[PDB]
Amino acid sequence: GYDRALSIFSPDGHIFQVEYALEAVKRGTCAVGVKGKNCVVLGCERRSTLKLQDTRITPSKVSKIDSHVVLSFSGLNADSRILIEKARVEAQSHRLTLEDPVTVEYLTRYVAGVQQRYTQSGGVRPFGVSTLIAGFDPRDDEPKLYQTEPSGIYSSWSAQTIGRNSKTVREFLEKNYDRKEPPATVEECVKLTVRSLLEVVQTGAKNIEITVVKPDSDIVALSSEEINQYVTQIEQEKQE
Amino acid sequence: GSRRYDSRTTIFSPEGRLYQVEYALESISHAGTAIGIMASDGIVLAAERKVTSTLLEQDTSTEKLYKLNDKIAVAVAGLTADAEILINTARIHAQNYLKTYNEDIPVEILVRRLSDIKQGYTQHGGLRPFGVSFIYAGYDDRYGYQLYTSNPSGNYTGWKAISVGANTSAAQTLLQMDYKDDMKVDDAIELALKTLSKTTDSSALTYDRLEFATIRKGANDGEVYQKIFKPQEIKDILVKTGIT
Amino acid sequence: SDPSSINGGIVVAMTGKDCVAIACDLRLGSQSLGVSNKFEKIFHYGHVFLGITGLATDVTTLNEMFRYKTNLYKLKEERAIEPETFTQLVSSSLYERRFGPYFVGPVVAGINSKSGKPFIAGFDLIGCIDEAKDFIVSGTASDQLFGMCESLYEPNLEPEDLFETISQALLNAADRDALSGWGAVVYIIKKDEVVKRYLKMRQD
Amino acid sequence: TTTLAFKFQHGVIAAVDSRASAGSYISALRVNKVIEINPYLLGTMSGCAADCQYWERLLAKECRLYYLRNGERISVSAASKLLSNMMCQYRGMGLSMGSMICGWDKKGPGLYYVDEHGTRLSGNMFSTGSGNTYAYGVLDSNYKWDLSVEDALYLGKRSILAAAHRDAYSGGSVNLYHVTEDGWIYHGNHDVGELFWKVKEEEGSFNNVIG
Amino acid sequence: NNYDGDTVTFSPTGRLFQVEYALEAIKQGSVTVGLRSNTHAVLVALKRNADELSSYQKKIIKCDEHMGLSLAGLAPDARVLSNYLRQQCNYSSLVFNRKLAVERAGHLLCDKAQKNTQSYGGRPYGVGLLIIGYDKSGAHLLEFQPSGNVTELYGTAIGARSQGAKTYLERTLDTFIKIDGNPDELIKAGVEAISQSLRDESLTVDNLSIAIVGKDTPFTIYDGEAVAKYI
Amino acid sequence: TQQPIVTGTSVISMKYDNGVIIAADNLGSYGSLLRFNGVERLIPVGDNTVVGISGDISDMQHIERLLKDLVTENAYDNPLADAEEALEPSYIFEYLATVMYQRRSKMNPLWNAIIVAGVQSNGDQFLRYVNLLGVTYSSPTLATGFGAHMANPLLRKVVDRESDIPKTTVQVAEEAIVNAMRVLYYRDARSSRNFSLAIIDKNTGLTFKKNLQVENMKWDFAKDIKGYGTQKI
Amino acid sequence: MDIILGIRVQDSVILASSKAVTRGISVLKDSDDKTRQLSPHTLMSFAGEAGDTVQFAEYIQANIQLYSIREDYELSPQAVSSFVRQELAKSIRSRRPYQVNVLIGGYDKKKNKPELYQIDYLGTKVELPYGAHGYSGFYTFSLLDHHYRPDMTTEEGLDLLKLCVQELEKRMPMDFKGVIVKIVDKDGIRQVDDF
Amino acid sequence: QFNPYGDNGGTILGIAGEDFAVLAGDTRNITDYSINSRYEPKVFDCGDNIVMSANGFAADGDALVKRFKNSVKWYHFDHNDKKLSINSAARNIQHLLYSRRFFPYYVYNIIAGLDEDGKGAVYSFDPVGSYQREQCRAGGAAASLIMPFLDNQVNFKNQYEPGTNGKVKKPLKYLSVEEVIKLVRDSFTSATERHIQVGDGLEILIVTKDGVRKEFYELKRD
Amino acid sequence: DRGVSTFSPEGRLFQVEYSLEAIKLGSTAIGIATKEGVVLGVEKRATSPLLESDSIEKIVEIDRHIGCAMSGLTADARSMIEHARTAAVTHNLYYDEDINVESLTQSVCDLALRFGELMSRPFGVALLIAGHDADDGYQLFHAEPSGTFYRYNAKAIGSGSEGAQAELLNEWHSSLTLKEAELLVLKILKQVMEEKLDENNAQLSCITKQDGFKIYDNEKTAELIKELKEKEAAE
Numbered sequence A: 001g002y003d004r005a006l007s008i009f010s011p012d013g014h015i016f017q018v019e020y021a022l023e024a025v026k027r028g029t030c031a032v033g034v035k036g037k038n039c040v041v042l043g044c045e046r047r048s049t050l051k052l053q054d055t056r057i058t059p060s061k062v063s064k065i066d067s068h069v070v071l072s073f074s075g076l077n078a079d080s081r082i083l084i085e086k087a088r089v090e091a092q093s094h095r096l097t098l099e100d101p102v103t104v105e106y107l108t109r110y111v112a113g114v115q116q117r118y119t120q121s122g123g124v125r126p127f128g129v130s131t132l133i134a135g136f137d138p139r140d141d142e143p144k145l146y147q148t149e150p151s152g153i154y155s156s157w158s159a160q161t162i163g164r165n166s167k168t169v170r171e172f173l174e175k176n177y178d179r180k181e182p183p184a185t186v187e188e189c190v191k192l193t194v195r196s197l198l199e200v201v202q203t204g205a206k207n208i209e210i211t212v213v214k215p216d217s218d219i220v221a222l223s224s225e226e227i228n229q230y231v232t233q234i235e236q237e238k239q240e
Numbered sequence B: 001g002s003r004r005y006d007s008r009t010t011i012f013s014p015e016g017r018l019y020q021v022e023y024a025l026e027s028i029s030h031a032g033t034a035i036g037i038m039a040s041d042g043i044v045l046a047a048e049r050k051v052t053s054t055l056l057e058q059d060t061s062t063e064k065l066y067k068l069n070d071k072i073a074v075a076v077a078g079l080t081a082d083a084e085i086l087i088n089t090a091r092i093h094a095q096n097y098l099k100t101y102n103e104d105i106p107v108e109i110l111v112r113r114l115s116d117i118k119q120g121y122t123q124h125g126g127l128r129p130f131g132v133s134f135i136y137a138g139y140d141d142r143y144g145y146q147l148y149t150s151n152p153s154g155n156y157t158g159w160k161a162i163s164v165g166a167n168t169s170a171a172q173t174l175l176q177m178d179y180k181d182d183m184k185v186d187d188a189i190e191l192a193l194k195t196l197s198k199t200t201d202s203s204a205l206t207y208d209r210l211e212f213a214t215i216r217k218g219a220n221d222g223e224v225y226q227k228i229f230k231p232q233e234i235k236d237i238l239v240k241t242g243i244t
Numbered sequence C: 001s002d003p004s005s006i007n008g009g010i011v012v013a014m015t016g017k018d019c020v021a022i023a024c025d026l027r028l029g030s031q032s033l034g035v036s037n038k039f040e041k042i043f044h045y046g047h048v049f050l051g052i053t054g055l056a057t058d059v060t061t062l063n064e065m066f067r068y069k070t071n072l073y074k075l076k077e078e079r080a081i082e083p084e085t086f087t088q089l090v091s092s093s094l095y096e097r098r099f100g101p102y103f104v105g106p107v108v109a110g111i112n113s114k115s116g117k118p119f120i121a122g123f124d125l126i127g128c129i130d131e132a133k134d135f136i137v138s139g140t141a142s143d144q145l146f147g148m149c150e151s152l153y154e155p156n157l158e159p160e161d162l163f164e165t166i167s168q169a170l171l172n173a174a175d176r177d178a179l180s181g182w183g184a185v186v187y188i189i190k191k192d193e194v195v196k197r198y199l200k201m202r203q204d
Numbered sequence D: 001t002t003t004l005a006f007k008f009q010h011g012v013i014a015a016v017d018s019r020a021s022a023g024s025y026i027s028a029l030r031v032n033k034v035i036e037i038n039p040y041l042l043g044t045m046s047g048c049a050a051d052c053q054y055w056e057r058l059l060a061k062e063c064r065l066y067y068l069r070n071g072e073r074i075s076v077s078a079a080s081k082l083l084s085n086m087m088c089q090y091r092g093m094g095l096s097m098g099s100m101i102c103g104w105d106k107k108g109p110g111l112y113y114v115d116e117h118g119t120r121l122s123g124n125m126f127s128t129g130s131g132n133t134y135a136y137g138v139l140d141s142n143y144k145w146d147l148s149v150e151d152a153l154y155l156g157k158r159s160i161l162a163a164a165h166r167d168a169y170s171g172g173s174v175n176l177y178h179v180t181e182d183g184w185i186y187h188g189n190h191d192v193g194e195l196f197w198k199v200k201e202e203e204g205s206f207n208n209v210i211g
Numbered sequence E: 001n002n003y004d005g006d007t008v009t010f011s012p013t014g015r016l017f018q019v020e021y022a023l024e025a026i027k028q029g030s031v032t033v034g035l036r037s038n039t040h041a042v043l044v045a046l047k048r049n050a051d052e053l054s055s056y057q058k059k060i061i062k063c064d065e066h067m068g069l070s071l072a073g074l075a076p077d078a079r080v081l082s083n084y085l086r087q088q089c090n091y092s093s094l095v096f097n098r099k100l101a102v103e104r105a106g107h108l109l110c111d112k113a114q115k116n117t118q119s120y121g122g123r124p125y126g127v128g129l130l131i132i133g134y135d136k137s138g139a140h141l142l143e144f145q146p147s148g149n150v151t152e153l154y155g156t157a158i159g160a161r162s163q164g165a166k167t168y169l170e171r172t173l174d175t176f177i178k179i180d181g182n183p184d185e186l187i188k189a190g191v192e193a194i195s196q197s198l199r200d201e202s203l204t205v206d207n208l209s210i211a212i213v214g215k216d217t218p219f220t221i222y223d224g225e226a227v228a229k230y231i
Numbered sequence F: 001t002q003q004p005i006v007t008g009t010s011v012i013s014m015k016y017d018n019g020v021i022i023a024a025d026n027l028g029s030y031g032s033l034l035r036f037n038g039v040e041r042l043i044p045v046g047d048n049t050v051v052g053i054s055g056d057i058s059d060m061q062h063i064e065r066l067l068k069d070l071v072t073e074n075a076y077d078n079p080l081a082d083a084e085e086a087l088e089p090s091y092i093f094e095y096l097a098t099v100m101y102q103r104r105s106k107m108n109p110l111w112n113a114i115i116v117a118g119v120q121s122n123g124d125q126f127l128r129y130v131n132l133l134g135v136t137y138s139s140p141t142l143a144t145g146f147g148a149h150m151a152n153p154l155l156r157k158v159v160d161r162e163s164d165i166p167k168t169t170v171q172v173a174e175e176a177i178v179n180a181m182r183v184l185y186y187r188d189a190r191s192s193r194n195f196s197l198a199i200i201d202k203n204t205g206l207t208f209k210k211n212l213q214v215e216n217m218k219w220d221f222a223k224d225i226k227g228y229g230t231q232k233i
Numbered sequence G: 001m002d003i004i005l006g007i008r009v010q011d012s013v014i015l016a017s018s019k020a021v022t023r024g025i026s027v028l029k030d031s032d033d034k035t036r037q038l039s040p041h042t043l044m045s046f047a048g049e050a051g052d053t054v055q056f057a058e059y060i061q062a063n064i065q066l067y068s069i070r071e072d073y074e075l076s077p078q079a080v081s082s083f084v085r086q087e088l089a090k091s092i093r094s095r096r097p098y099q100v101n102v103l104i105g106g107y108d109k110k111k112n113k114p115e116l117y118q119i120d121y122l123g124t125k126v127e128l129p130y131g132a133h134g135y136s137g138f139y140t141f142s143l144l145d146h147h148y149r150p151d152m153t154t155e156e157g158l159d160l161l162k163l164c165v166q167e168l169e170k171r172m173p174m175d176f177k178g179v180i181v182k183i184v185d186k187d188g189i190r191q192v193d194d195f
Numbered sequence H: 001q002f003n004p005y006g007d008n009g010g011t012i013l014g015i016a017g018e019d020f021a022v023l024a025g026d027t028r029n030i031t032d033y034s035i036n037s038r039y040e041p042k043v044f045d046c047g048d049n050i051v052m053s054a055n056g057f058a059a060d061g062d063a064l065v066k067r068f069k070n071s072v073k074w075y076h077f078d079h080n081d082k083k084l085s086i087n088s089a090a091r092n093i094q095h096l097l098y099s100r101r102f103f104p105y106y107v108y109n110i111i112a113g114l115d116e117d118g119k120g121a122v123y124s125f126d127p128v129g130s131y132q133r134e135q136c137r138a139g140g141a142a143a144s145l146i147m148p149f150l151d152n153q154v155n156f157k158n159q160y161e162p163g164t165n166g167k168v169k170k171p172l173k174y175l176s177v178e179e180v181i182k183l184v185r186d187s188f189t190s191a192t193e194r195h196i197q198v199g200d201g202l203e204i205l206i207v208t209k210d211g212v213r214k215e216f217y218e219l220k221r222d
Numbered sequence I: 001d002r003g004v005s006t007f008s009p010e011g012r013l014f015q016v017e018y019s020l021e022a023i024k025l026g027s028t029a030i031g032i033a034t035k036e037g038v039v040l041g042v043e044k045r046a047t048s049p050l051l052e053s054d055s056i057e058k059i060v061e062i063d064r065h066i067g068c069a070m071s072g073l074t075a076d077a078r079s080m081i082e083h084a085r086t087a088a089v090t091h092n093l094y095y096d097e098d099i100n101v102e103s104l105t106q107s108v109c110d111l112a113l114r115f116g117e118l119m120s121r122p123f124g125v126a127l128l129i130a131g132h133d134a135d136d137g138y139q140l141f142h143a144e145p146s147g148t149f150y151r152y153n154a155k156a157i158g159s160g161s162e163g164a165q166a167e168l169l170n171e172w173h174s175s176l177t178l179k180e181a182e183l184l185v186l187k188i189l190k191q192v193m194e195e196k197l198d199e200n201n202a203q204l205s206c207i208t209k210q211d212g213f214k215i216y217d218n219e220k221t222a223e224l225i226k227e228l229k230e231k232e233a234a235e
């Protein structure tokens, strides 16, 4: 079998293949995650270079791993499918062997472990993908939001963004998001998520996707018109 | 040892691109243009054969349009030999699904499977990727008529109208201009041929330089028919639309 | 215990003048218990017809397998498979399980689309081909069917006469078999039309 | 062997005998048929002693690793399932193990029956081994959810005594356990010889036997 | 230069540079001395610390009741090779009820190290070993190089500044070989030998490591206050 | 799992003051057929060990080749192969014992019973038994098959315990062994008159005696035995 | 285990399964639910050798749940039954086959039709208006053959099911400790808590 | 058909004192009705103040002891010459036995020594690896003859105090090493009389804080 | 290119030496051993204020009697921790006892050099393994990707290591109390950290014979930080 060590250290103590995988993430469309008091919202950018697209059948950016956990990403699209499939298999494997669904932290730890494994295994390259994993633990009303990256490190975030121009939207979130008082309602959480994407997106038409996840496996994706109403209200307040 | 001669086909560039995938896409940009257009009552697949000869046996020839099953077909752009490897795998996958569930495979599931195979060659194994881009035209009872494309990266997307191969930039602009949502198959047939006629590198668009196919519910009552056009039938539709 | 007689069932095929016929009972049982009266044992792949007797799980499995293989054949060959070619495919497929066989008694019937010649064939569970001119029998009442066919059959029967002959061969054989019956179907096959007839019979 | 376990108001009681035999020969008078997996988990033993000891001490390994990775104690449901999955791998290979996994977790008290076939049953009351039929008689006629810890301990004790008396392959002594939300509590070793006479006098039972 | 990228490549003068670079790792290692008489064999090792808070890296490893070694270079490679010796000594006992001859132990180490010098992908071992032992033919001392070369000697030293101790033993050859039935005097000669390789630092109580094996003496290692007697 | 085809019967042995004696007949039986009359079942290993083998002959020949290879292998890179690092009886036995137990553990045994007789470096007598099951034991006298039932009782009258070994001379020990071989010829239906005998002494070394015969047999009393009860003529 | 029954009426499928579990000569449990929800509109009851039953059921459940998540779509009862059949036909020629018989009751939301599939451990599949496994059919099929109509209501289906259980309770030597009854229709799966 | 198992007879006995432990066993080795050896040692000093005996099929017994002795050696190598405690040795032996769960070592095994508080310890094993600490255990051929006698004379079972008539038990007073050896010798003398596989010789290994001592006694040779 | 297991002309493995450079870029971790216990402390170093700092887990339990702190490519540590936990619990299964700290450390270090062309590269993380056993008492080990491990009275790893180690050189003595060690870790962490030390960006832990391994609460550490400030202002 092909055993070639592709991810290796350089004289300055860097693994370039892992670092170049982060550059692939930088190229990917922007993804954002914001957790309110009783919910988590996942926002995703859709680049409008591709029109004549069939939005019914085109792979959506946010993927359900189980009925209570979701996963969005930034980077190579094909790479993300492999992580999602593995995550979905592990979710059912956990339910089967332990009789409880996975915690959001556990699912994140698994996906992060897969990413790490691909940084010190022979004949393979790292995943060019960073993920945002969100949801609610079984019989728990505390929101969960985690981030992973090609190196395999993961951590919990009150709010986070990844992908192209993520530096700008993180700048926005850092000054707008208050920890002592997070978005109390679904409206406030979605509004803040749309606002953050409007710093980067371009047009607020079909370029913004929003997915709201609430406790007890209550997950819904907002439509174009519902999002368009947020886009309208934000700019009308801005004209002042 | 052997390491000396390894090109390392599955690595990132400093910019975060996959070298071999990008170069495979460069190869595909020189292949004959293939176009797919989805209508409310069917799908059209049109494709240009590359600089042919008068001594080529056209009626028994197939380089662009292939049948995966009774409901799904593909248009090819790139290395034909590479495409046939993948096509035969897809044909088997469709039959595996049918045997397991006793239902015809949903279009997206077949597309995802082939796209995952392409993805694998970019991440592990140390082999060159498949220099192929597909346009998938298919029907199932969930989403109805569907158009997809996949490329050597293993990434796939859905479309109302799309082109692959040569002059896609020019072709996509022309499609984006004249396409409408309430369009029908007969209109889509005309759009596909008109787009090829303007984007072609050849002097004139003739029957012997084309492969054509439709997927219609124009089959007697609630069912779908695949029509791979014969040379004489391509010649007739060229006259009908007013190109020759 | 005997896998070939757990579920029960029969199939018979006959040649006629420019036609063939293939027929089967509809019973599926668990030894003495009758489970289903709609278990058809005849399938078709294009214009080639295949009847299968024996263990029901293998009947279903082999149908799905030959559907799989004939669909690929057609995609590659760009034509429907012929009875002679399909017969060899059945034989090859059964012999590959020589030491772990499907417990079945397949029967092929059809008309070659090019030559127009009627064709029938029978197999044992492991692929041996019996290419008869007159008739083929299979199942738990095969002894009964042999006796009926060997006396009732005559060559060059017209389609509507052949129907009566094969129907009476099946019906009376099934009525002397505890594990066969519960309905019956007969296919009458001509070069470009096929008629399917369900027969009325005793339901015990 | 006779083992029993039952859920009640104030947790779960676990009681076992202590006899081990090789044919008619009583090879051990005092075997420990309960394993302390962790301060909140117990496992009973019936069948082959080697299989019971090996696979339930291996279960404790897996429950400890669960706690280290997750920082949280394993549920009774999850622990019982890990064990039943171990049995499913050696499915048909000839293992002989019948056990009850007793504990207290976030859902309150928990009790699962697991055997060598891979069977996994949740319930309020179970009994296993050669003398389980005798124990069930006493249990079924006296069990309530409204039992006190004192009365519940006695019921499980008295139920093992019933089996030890009649079943030739049950006896020796009774080991009692009481599982709470603050952990299991051992309630001693009780010789059946001494217990029988004590119960006969105080309770008036076993009139048929002369003392 | 162009021929040192891997172990599978000879240079134009017939040299194996990766093996030579592995040999270099031994020279960087701390000094260790070996010497023997006709009755006993002794190892003396100068242990090295990282700093004042750290412990002193152990240098001597027991392989069997009648055999053991001292290391200089990559310590993990010594653990791998000593583990192999333990297994081979143990295979000899379990199968043949026979204590493994020291000479045969050297032949086994040679062959194990050699395989790493001729194949692609692997690397040579980066450690040198001094094996002592007492078998049916008396006391023995061996020197192992990761090139594969194993040598039987009366006395020797490996590691940094080992040339000083090696010269001393070459002078003392006729004296220390005759130290029969006197373990303490043989150790003294070894401690005096390793002292010829010291600069700036001297032998302290947690610095010095000594091992001995002999006629009626199992392989035993002395550390801590057990070697204060010899300081 | 197999069955033995061509077989060898008893091997008998005992310790004496300065060494050990071992003996075995020269027959290779094929069931009740006394097929092969020139089979050597005592196999010397160096000048300090004799391995006596009973049971399946094809397996014996295999073991014979293993021992021959063991000598070859011991000499490799061994300057003291004919001195301090020569093969000992204890080494040879432990090797065979390892092989026998491994083969039984794979359910494919070497269908033999083996006695390793020899003298160690320090002059100590070595005498140990091993068989197809990997079972091992040592005793002042050892015998396989019929020898265990008939020879051991006779040999144990000479050396009944450990303290009788120094009191037993080589002449007395050989006399007992030779008598036992005669008794086995009277009573074992798979025995032969021809046998081999080996003595391993700490002073005089290995003495291997071939083509020995059972002699001084009592048969004359047979002439007086008539009928099975009442018959007089 | 012992008893599993199924009946397909006008607008629903009703599955009835016994509650008993026996080890040796002792009935360990009289409230066991011999069923698993494979999807919101598909229920599978099971009976066979100890251990294998639950193991197989949970394995099928995990596979269907995995499919549901991957495609964001519920497989038709027919598709699920074919998947199950293939797994059993695969299993019968394995080193150690899974000795499990199943009934699959589902409501097809596309066709708006209830569907009942009977599959034995060999992988023998049949679609039926009513079905059973083991000896259950020997006692009950004569009643079902007589009383069954395809236009029956759910309430009429339950009454005919009660008559079947009563006949079983009269003529079977084994005490199966009553049955748990579940209904599968357009609204999903629900349990009849009084039977 | 080849039978990989055999029976070599023999009997063993372990008794735990207050600050000592004894492991005894007869020296006779047999097959069927023949004697293989009158003196074939069966109880072994395994190092670290632990004694061991694997009674039953001698080939499996020798293999297990050999592997445990090996396990002690590697325990020293791997854990800085740490002394293997009797409880740790016992658990280790369980895993040695259970590795052959489906092709078992056909032996009843006993080990004896001192626990970590200096008190006498005996552990007893079945062929598949179930084990437990005990005060008293006889194993092997005559195990059923000896154990009841030890229940009576070591644990004072069914013995009460005169005058009370069954009300007060005989108190469980501790036994000296001289007292235990008397009970061991009488146990084997009695077993020799009624069991054909027991005889020839008796070898006792006594374990104290000072080390392992041996004692040998003659038994009847018939 | 060149082999992954290649020696340099100086006699060092290139990859091992390069992994050591990655560890120098890692956040600081300090360990101090005393006769009353071993203290482990780490710099969390959150990349952004929105990152919930309590999810940063750079101090980890291996067993009840063994703790572990990490520095460098922390993702690499997860499989090492998993192996350590398995080794610790497996030894308890085989020997009915706690495993020696040195033996646990040796087991972790055996993974280190299992790389080539096994894993494709060495680990890019260093570990401070602290614990207690009955034989050698309270112990602190430094486990490197070279496969080497040194025992230490006190040790610092990560970006501020050489500065911290010089400070530990002067401050450590054999009579340190547990409380004194706690403040000493906080003091040296505060010295080498970029951001100002508080209970949210720094974490403490310890291992004692009685209570075993414990990660300190943010409330408990906050008091020790306040106690540190006052005693530094006291002179």
Ligand SMILES: *[B]([O])([O])[C]([C][C]([C])[C])[N]C(=O)[C]([C]C1=[C][C]=[C][C]=[C]1)[N]C(=O)C1=[C]N=[C][C]=N1
Residues within 6 Å of the ligand: D001, D002, D019, D020, D021, D022, D027, D031, D033, D045, D046, D047, D048, D049, D050, D052, D129, D130, D169, H126, H130
């Ligand atoms: B009990 O009877 O199930 C008991 C439980 C075990 C944990 C000690 N088992 C045994 O007594 C079995 C025999 C048996 C008797 C009755 C039913 C089932 C099994 N004996 C042993 O496990 C055993 C093990 N080693 C030595 C002697 N006996």
Ligand SMILES: [Mg+2]
Residues within 6 Å of the ligand: C203, C204
């Ligand atoms: Mg009938």
Ligand SMILES: [Mg+2]
Residues within 6 Å of the ligand: D163, D164, D165, D166, D167, D168, D169, D170, D171
């Ligand atoms: Mg009893």
Ligand SMILES: [Mg+2]
Residues within 6 Å of the ligand: H191, H192, H193, H194, H195, H196, H197, H198, H199, H222
């Ligand atoms: Mg006797």
